[PDB]
């Protein structure tokens, strides 16, 4: 007090990679708490916690253990209604999940393959083996990470245009939460926060309209998304035959 | 004014509402507990029917207040009647339902429009038929004639159910988009399927589609608002050997 312990999932740079952990960090700072960060990575999670969890994020509030990023957010609104609210109501929760699933299929799907080797190489030394064989086999390969990531220069141009439905929303609002951000923003942002933690070449063009919301989000809470290990999201260079990355239109 | 608001409808020959914008307005009004004074009429003569006030419907008249556009009407009701059940819970709902609505219009309305545009024409009021024909055959392209656009729908309709899975995924975990009770998010989404049911002379969904629970409860709301005599069934799509599996069965 005013502190809550958080079990992180970090890269070798100390930088968070897990989007679930990312939106939980933002949710905690939204509520105005200080975070006691427990470092670590993909391996040894059960041992790092008291045996209470095989997954992160996990928080400990005084001595109350809360598992699952979604549950954590609901817990914070329930126990601390006096601090800035994360959810507007039940309708937000349902429509959030629809947006989140779409971002995951549209952005995370393709980008995961484009950065799967960077993902591995940027991980903690103890993690790299576990990440290698399991990722190139479970999620899956069926073969190896150098072969899956190869050719990303050809895939990355194809993603920006597909994000237009999301651009369409942010064109007419400052935050998903309106004039101020909430968990809808943080959950959406987590997709791009993960991407920045592993993207050793930028997935978006320098003038993508998303940049306004993205930079503001990453700057929130004293630069929560500006950890020294983070990579630029912007700088994608396109070719004559590439698709236009976004709709260029003004503006009645 | 008792408890009454006037609504300029957009009806087919059966008296059934076709416009999804009008549909979600009917639900919004009933959600607020109002009685609806319906002004009938179809696609033609809207400027005549209104005071020269609108070329489009829905329009409502609340005592002397004329209100245009279904989204604005919903906001107007929440602003003027904060004592009656809320349509929006806040700004976040508004932003995220636009995202869902946009997706539903791209995924469901677009393909089903092409599949039912001739039925749409045939079911409209007699005085609207030629206008709907000429209008649609120049604007939304399709394009050819109504007959050509709708031709081959038996091969296209089986392709739509699989693409609705992202929407199923949400409804499999909640009673309503609004939670334990419906609100404008539900009514806006339902309006897509209400429109479809008004023009679909062959069913677009299988009898066992997991969407049916929400759809039937939705259509049944407010004394069967979605059960007007003219409505066609959404269910009964007959899949053939080659067709894709319509939904995830896990």
Numbering used by the authors:
A (entry chain B): 4 to 255
B (entry chain A): 3 to 252
Provide the authors' own sentences about this structure as they appear in the paper:
Following oxidation of the α-hydroxyl group in GGE by a Cα-dehydrogenase, stereospecific glutathione (GSH)-dependent cleavage of the β-ether linkage in β-(3′-methoxyphenoxy)-γ-hydroxypropiovanillone (MPHPV) is catalyzed by the glutathione S-transferase (GST) enzymes LigE and LigF, forming β-glutathionyl-γ-hydroxypropiovanillone (GS-HPV) and guaiacol. LigE catalyzes stereospecific cleavage of (βR)-MPHPV to (βS)-GS-HPV, whereas LigF catalyzes the cleavage of (βS)-MPHPV to (βR)-GS-HPV. Consistent with their classification as GST enzymes, LigE and LigF each adopt the canonical GST domain fold with an N-terminal thioredoxin domain (residues 1–82 and 1–76, respectively) and a C-terminal α-helical domain (residues 93–255 and 93–242, respectively) connected by a short linker (residues 83–92 and 77–92, respectively). Biochemical and small angle x-ray scattering data suggest that both LigE and LigF exist as dimers in solution, and these dimers, related by 2-fold symmetry, can be seen in the respective crystal structures.
Attempts to solve the structure of full-length wild-type LigE (282 residues) and LigF (254 residues) were unsuccessful, but C-terminal truncation constructs of both proteins were generated, successfully crystallized, and used for structural analysis. LigEΔ255 and the LigEΔ255-GSH complex crystallized in the space group C2 with four molecules in the asymmetric unit with electron density for the bound GSH molecule. In the LigE dimer, helix α4 of one monomer is interdigitated between α4 and α7 of the other monomer, and the entire dimer interface is contained within the α-helical domain. The dimer is anchored by a hydrophobic lock-and-key motif in which Phe-101 of each monomer is in a hydrophobic pocket formed in the second monomer. This motif is seen in several GST classes, including Alpha, Mu, and Phi, which display the more typical four-helix bundle dimer mode rather than the elongated dimer of LigE. An extended loop between α5 and α6 in the C-terminal domain, which protrudes above the normal α3/α4 packing site, may be responsible for the alternate dimer formation in LigE. The C-terminal domains of both LigE and LigF are composed of six and eight α-helices, respectively. The loop between β1 and α1 is longer in LigE than in LigF and occupies the space between the thioredoxin domain and the α-helical domain, whereas in LigF, this loop is moved away from the domain interface toward the surface of the thioredoxin domain. Based on structural properties, LigE is most similar to the fungal GSTFuA class, suggesting that the enzymes in this class are present in both prokaryotes and fungi.
